[PDB]
Write a protein that binds this DNA or RNA. Structure first.
Length: 94
DNA sequence: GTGCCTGGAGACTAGGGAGTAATCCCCTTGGCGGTTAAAACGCGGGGGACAGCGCGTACGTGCGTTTAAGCGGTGCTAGAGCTGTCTACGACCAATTGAGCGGCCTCGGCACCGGGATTCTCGA
């Protein structure tokens, strides 16, 4: 039995950015609630936008428009930068 | 550090969406005149925004007192999972039917338009 969390990945990216910093468990649960909340926000907005575009699939175009909707524009263009980086580094399926 | 359980990774075969030909085609964007109700310039003002004073009171602050109330223990008590075991239980493709849309035709009070009766001016 387990509960799905992202404390290991948060600690990994935090030590990757700055290894000389720590984080307690209460703030870890707060950030886990935060990432589940924004995942719920983006997923429901993408489902709304897919149902509005007469298309019952989820591509990356709806996610791009959804992160252009709810995120601010500097974070929106940084998010499309990170997303294009993720697709271009994932497409090399060798 | 150490670790075993299990979601993660992934190729092959049916099987349903994507955007490129294609063509209507309706809505729109752009401009010319007019005319008109609304936008703009100005001018005297007076009524409402604003500074200041009178005051008194009620909260800023401090002190005796109670007053729950917090920290720590632990049994009492009764509410939250998990694996079996069985029952329902909502969907899949297909013939038949249906009931609300595409475009058509009929009423009906509101505003405009004319006569019957009444009132005003003159004539007979």
């Amino acid at each position: 039995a387990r509960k799905e969390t992202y404390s290991s990945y948060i600690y990994k990216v935090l030590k990757q950015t700055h290894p000389d910093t720590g984080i307690s468990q209460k703030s870890m649960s707060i950030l886990n609630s935060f990432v589940n909340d924004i995942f719920e926000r983006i997923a429901t907005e993408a489902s709304k936008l897919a149902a509005y575009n007469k298309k019952s699939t989820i591509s990356a175009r709806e996610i791009q428009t959804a992160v252009r909707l709810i995120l601010p524009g500097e974070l929106a263009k940084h998010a499309v930068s990170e997303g294009t980086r993720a697709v271009t580094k994932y497409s090399s399926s060798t």
